[model samples]
Target: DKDFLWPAPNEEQVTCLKMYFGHSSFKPVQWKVIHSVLEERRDNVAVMATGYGKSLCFQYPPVYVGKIGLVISPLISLMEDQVLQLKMSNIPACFLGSAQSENVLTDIKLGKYRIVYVTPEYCSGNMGLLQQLEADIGITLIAVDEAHCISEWGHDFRDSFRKLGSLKTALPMVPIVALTATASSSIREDIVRCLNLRNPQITCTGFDRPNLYLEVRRKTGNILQDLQPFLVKTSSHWEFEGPTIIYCPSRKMTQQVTGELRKLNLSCGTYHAGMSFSTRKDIHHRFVRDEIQCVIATIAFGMGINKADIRQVIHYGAPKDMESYYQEIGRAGRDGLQSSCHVLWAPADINLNRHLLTEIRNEKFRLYKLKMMAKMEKYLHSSRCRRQIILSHFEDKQVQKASLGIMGTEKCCDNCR
Candidate 1:
């Protein structure tokens, strides 16, 4: 609706874009969303795929408008990664979460950083922090990264993210932006309603990554036997010289897989919720630096990972849902090189995920999870183009059968070649 109303970037915004971002131009939908906030002071929801430059939409406006950008991030690791990137670009940024001290808040109030990232949990509990920015420093915009969490039907629902419903009331006048890598129509509606985004501009830049060869296989339940070959080069397949990630459904599986990888003389690390915080961070750091060839981890890993050369992602078992499966596999091939995403599915995984859903007391939410699980099961059994099936799940109708032709050339999936 606001398409024709979009305005050109003004002098100041253009200056900030070049100085901080070093980009000569904006990518698709970037200017569209940015204009909605900067020119119209309107709320917006953007659905851009991972590694597709969603951050730049919200990151540019604060500097252009001369007010602090408050980001409600779900994970501390993500905040740290973004902060590092922002600082390296010379855009002053810091994060407030479990690791931050009160002194960090003081710096924020003093207007030392243009961008501040906080978890939704802290944002809910600490009204004073938002008030300080509101009453003293002023805020240009509030952004919710992983905005899909606001939806009950979202693959990753956090109690903390549900508290984001209050963000509209807290910063009443400032524009808000909800950004996510994946969101279906239903999830999009929930996010808009939950965040109380008024007259928001919703933009989906499409969810298609042709570079990633998506494949799903029936699991033999022998993790080391099936997965080990993918790591080491074989005569038929290419050796993965870059980092690789193995996603497991349970902490026990993560440890067992790590031990197996080591026995095979692979340089690998283990990461799960059971590991010490420092240990997890160390493993994450080592993997990013390529000090570790592989990291076997539970679903807890990879949300904050921005490593570009991850050559392969193997699921030890079916992920809980399509959203999780897509997100986990997205960690690979970010550098635009051809990468492989292999899902090893065991029939037991459906029940395993169903059992895990019992931990949720909400009956309605449990049903939603079950529904998504069924879709994932259907996806596994389908003989259609894996890309088209995923796009269909997102309600995309503008798809063709022939688009998967390159996957055949690369032998990307079981169906293609």
Candidate 2:
């Protein structure tokens, strides 16, 4: 049962296909995009949620195509993991970044690898190694992972990402795929505009999580007090719940919360970007193993984490935007079992974050951050149903038909409690 057409080449291609998974097994929405790139050889853009296997679409086509599959990743760990994964899967992968050298660069140019991974800044080769892979003999496709970061409106905006269009122009006719785990309606439009995706086809496998109990607890002076009630309430119930993820807004809170929780004999650890990369990775791994009772982290947490039995995802500090809030909360109850989505709120939290952003060196991006911050706080403060407001933010026309609703009614909120 070959999902692909005949004329499938020698053993190497078959070998490459099997390492990923059984061939001919395409997840929903994947076949459409992969077929376009592999068969039609058309450029595509994918706006998929996290854990949806977005990497395979771009990773798959390169197996069949002659030249190397070139990927420019924004996160260093993500690039490293991908390189290791590809290599394990037996695809020769060369990574060019702060770690590599002239000899490594030379090997890359000499076409020693089937796939090359680079940071977004170096991929365009503006100031880094290899000047440009354009001189390289083999580079069939350019993949910009987490493409949402390219937009100013995106949660993570990297000015370097905007130069992807130049990369496209540099390698004319090479297919470009911009894939993101999270992007709102406005950001979706911005991704297409910024990336210059060629009349890209958009696909969204719906967002419906009913097995989670979404709740908001307003902050009192005591953070522990705020968390205890929810824990007490949920723990008393005879549920098959597990370790929780409590997302704080800063590195300081990550450390603070973890220290406090540990004193109470709860297994907890801090996770954030400010910590050493290894520490963050350790926190993620420990949390996944349920070795930690809780994980307190910042924006850098939870992108690639997979802990399906997570019974709760608590936001100690509110998210910067509804988009991030939606994605963070989505991480919970992934097993389609009942879990708790809770938030500790405060007006001071809003003002403090706004003031902090104002102190940023770049005032313009600061304003963009401020606007997004305001949107999240507004949603948190709103008396409206959190799900409805979230859905509306994504431009969903209808409300979550009762079956898909989280709280059973559109007026569900802390106020309703």
Candidate 3:
């Protein structure tokens, strides 16, 4: 599979990182991930914690590698967010998905872009796209963001992900790096098998976030009333002035919650897939700039949002699975300051998730989702340390087996306190 020798980043390559990314050094495990691909030419699977600099591991390589980096992402918003950040740093990057115009396609053919982003659906549906890129512009790296989707056993499984194996055939010499924030041992194995990663370096830089205080309260009949204590500013409660996110399960719930929060004089906005593209874009832009204090949205809201000062994240109901729940809560405390993550769970939330699973036509997948839903229910009702349980789910034993001081009064979870 080796077409040419892949060397480590030289002095010129090292300087390009700061020139483009504004980072003097790599985060915890970022350098190890990058080195695996550049120096060793091995397929890598990085299951880094959310809010960590996982993008840098992949994004920094193409700059010095002298070939275009092709990223296969799941969502369009994710692609746009990274492309915007790259442009802000004066790096030549663009997205080639359903949202792009023919002009972008022409630019790609001319080798004008250094980094290209495409959805798995687009890549799978268009077989000639990778071959065309290899023949014209040449590609050095293939990166799969949110790489957990490659697993059929995972919660966010997609049919198009199954076709990623074809990429190995198309670019035989190119090293593929699969990245995700959440994956259990089983899911990790599935991803490697599915993507056909050959002797990949698997790195997981722990999942402990001691800065985030986890809490779960029984859902009251009125969600607004339950949220008021956290949303409203009062001397009795912690400061509520920081940007917050309220995640709802449905579009209707998002709109209803947004309207109620706004009526209470909270500067909030609503976002969901049902909304117009321009409307979502406007809300996202305002939220990032801190012009909006809060955003009430479905799961569609938080994928690529890079805002670091998010003070808290609240779930109106139980999430579909623990992976999604962890990812959402990971958004908070990104600045490494103390932040709160609260979940209002009720019996009805379980029913809603069960109903969602039944709609999945695949029997195997439906059963898997149902199992995860059951596990989520257990997590809500469990007496163990919240952080411990989550760590154990990812098969992190050292932290999982130890008492993480989450049971103490200071920096402790709701149940522990």
Candidate 4:
């Protein structure tokens, strides 16, 4: 293990860790994982689930190793939120996108920043940035969030992600960490393979929420009449629940569901690729603050969310595939509180998803989405333990827990009953 071992925090490093964060103890899996990076000096990969505090895995190690860290994120808003949070905490961070200030690049090169966020698309060599990072101040940690997108078999593959391997090589002697909230067992191999790390450790805290009840129902295409009865039958009713999320398939569906839910006096909003960022953030804030009960949204949007305690998540239309479906549903019930996941499925939604996937110009991306869609179809048609079925896809076996068979206790869908 010493082959990758980073020397112990020479007294000064220990002071830096406590002084910067004001935390007496490290969060679980943080110190052990980070110690491997800083102490063991190895490139580590983590498949942590949502709310597992994955960001800290890379964010914390830099304080001991070096002041400089590089992060390649998938979404603009993700970078924006992270940069803001770090700055508010005085971490000296910056994110570069098309709209970034003109002086941002110069500030980064001057080593004025501790953390630099760049999307895979913008992290190219033409600008002589990578060279400066390698030659100038040593880059201690390299992070790739949403690392699953690097996989050719993933539901949301971005061709630019394929270049991350070469990008990792660009950073001289830097320890790397690839993070994703969601990835099945098979895809975890893809993540490790894609990054080409040495003896990389895969860490996952598991995604199952025994407190969240999962339910999938076939939609006859008539959304309201079908979902309404089952929802109303529950004891809490819609109003008693905390903030809810309603995911629709298309732009038309998003607008229609928001309008319909609003008429019922539910504080509702919609988000899709077409909406401005401000509008999306506005709706996100409303939902986050419990000012809105439901936010009807579409796929390919709303990527940078940090809201917790979301009580109900309803898929107003059929999800294209299980991977996308699980990731979206996993967003809800993150607080481990009792929550509900209701999926309304229709066979026809596949055609609509196919059309949407075709809109992706990259041939590789289109194929990935298609494969994801096929996985979704299998889940919808399956007659097995839904939770087991989903976890098995990611290669996680169902360990026998006393709670495994119970809905509210074990946290399974109605079908499990």
Model 1 C-alpha lDDT versus the unseen true structure: 0.75
Q: Model 1 TM-score?
A: 0.53
Candidate 2 clashes between residue pairs 3 or more apart in a chain or in different chains: 267-293
Output the better candidate (2/3) by lDDT.
Answer: 3
* Model 1 error, position 277 (Å): 2.6
Which digits, one per residue and each the tens of the lDDT, describe model 4 over residues 1-417? 111112223456456666766554453346557877775667777777563356677777765655678888877787788789778877888887666748587787788888888888887533357667768877777888888898989788888788788755665367778887764656777887888887776555445567667777878766567656534333433442567777787788887766666555655777888878788777777776778766778876434465667788888777756646766876776566878888887767753457778788987567666666766777777766676666545422332232365533345766666
Off by over 4 Å in 3: 1-175, 178-205, 233-239, 350-361, 399-409
TM-scores, all candidates, are 0.53, 0.50, 0.54, 0.51
lDDT values, one for every candidate? 0.75, 0.66, 0.76, 0.68
TM-score ranking from best candidate downward? 3, 1, 4, 2
Off by over 4 Å in 2: 1-205, 232-241, 350-352, 357-366, 398-417
Clashes of each: 0, 1, 0, 11
Question: In model 1, which regions exceed 4 Å deviation?
Answer: 1-175, 178-207, 233-241, 350-361, 395-412
In terms of lDDT, which candidate is stronger, 2 or 4? 4
- lDDT per residue (tens digit) for residues 1-417 in model 1: 111112445566667788998875664367778877877889998876564466788889887766799889876787789899999998889888656856586788888888999888888987767878878877888989888887777788878888788877877888889988774657778888999999898776555566788888888878666775586554543334568888888887888877776666677888877668988888889988887888888878986476778888988888867767766876778677878888888888743466777777877667666667777788888886777666545422333333445545545466765
Instruction: Report how far residue 11 has shifted in candidate 4, in Å.
Output: 47
Residue lDDT tens for model 3, 210-238: 78888888888586678868855655432
